[PDB]
Amino acid sequence: TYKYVNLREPSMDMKSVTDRAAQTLLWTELIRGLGMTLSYLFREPATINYPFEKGPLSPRFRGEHALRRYPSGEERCIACKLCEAVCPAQAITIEAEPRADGSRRTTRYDIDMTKCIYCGFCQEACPVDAIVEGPNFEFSTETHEELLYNKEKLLNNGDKWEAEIAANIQADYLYR
């Protein structure tokens, strides 16, 4: 159930002593290493041509946040604050009130994308699939406060990426 790495005594007949001395004087293993490096020289390299080719992803992928809507236009967030209660970085800040037609909807729904740890607890705690963590990951900013998303930026990410988020959730939701 155990093995001894490096416990081989070298043979001491004239054949193997001459082989080790030719290895010392004629550098067998150094030519072996050069042969392996030359063997990787003649290969097709694994470099994809980004930004024209994209690395492979799964429909489970956790990128930029987005608030979804029902297939009626009504947004799914009903202000229940499970996503900010489960959020391990406390990046989510929610404040709500009953709106003009008496519905439990949010007024403030902020996700600080510089606190957020992209772990997808908010999308798996959300009981109505409102907040999801979408497939975009190329959303770098030149300014720090552009990564402080309010409700309007999250709703625009939802209305931007819904045609892809709906298909990822459609391919994935049976595992949840």
Binding site: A89, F137, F139, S140
Partner: protein, 156 residues
């Protein structure tokens, strides 16, 4: 005029020379150093973009703060940044280098390296993918491309 054309083509020349020869310094801090190494890995391969490691700050262009900046290494980050020649740039990688991150309310975390160094590009993620870090580097190259150094100098 003629001189506007001269300084415009010289700006395009020096912006090309500075965006297609970015030499980042070997500077990781935390988990994001692993994904910065994967941005150097043979799949994504920074080196094809002219983006190659130089170990000393004197011989490097952009400082990728990749990881968590604590209170104990904030002056080390600042003196590394100061010992970079101008033009020097900063790419912020990961949530802790952006805004404090997962350790935001900690007693010993500098809440973002924008408190310490001037930051050009913010790359978001915990960690951002190496594809997203390469996106941030290409957006830094786009930011260098539209600089107007000699055009403003000829117009000042």
């Amino acid at each position: 005029s003629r001189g506007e054309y001269v300084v415009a083509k010289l700006d395009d020349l020096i912006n090309w020379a500075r965006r297609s020869s970015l030499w980042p310094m070997t500077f990781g801090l935390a988990c994001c150093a692993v994904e910065m190494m994967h941005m150097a890995a043979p799949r994504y391969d920074m080196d094809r973009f002219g983006v190659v490691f130089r170990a000393s700050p004197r011989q490097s262009d952009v400082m990728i703060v990749a990881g968590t900046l604590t209170n104990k290494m904030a002056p080390a980050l600042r003196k590394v940044y100061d010992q970079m020649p101008e033009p020097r740039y900063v790419v912020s990688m990961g949530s802790c280098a952006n805004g404090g991150g997962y350790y935001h309310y900690s007693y010993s975390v500098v809440r973002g390296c924008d408190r310490i160094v001037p930051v050009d590009i913010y790359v978001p993620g915990c960690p951002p993918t190496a594809e997203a870090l390469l996106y941030g580097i290409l957006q830094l190259q786009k930011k260098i491309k539209r600089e107007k150094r000699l055009r403003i100098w000829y117009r000042r």
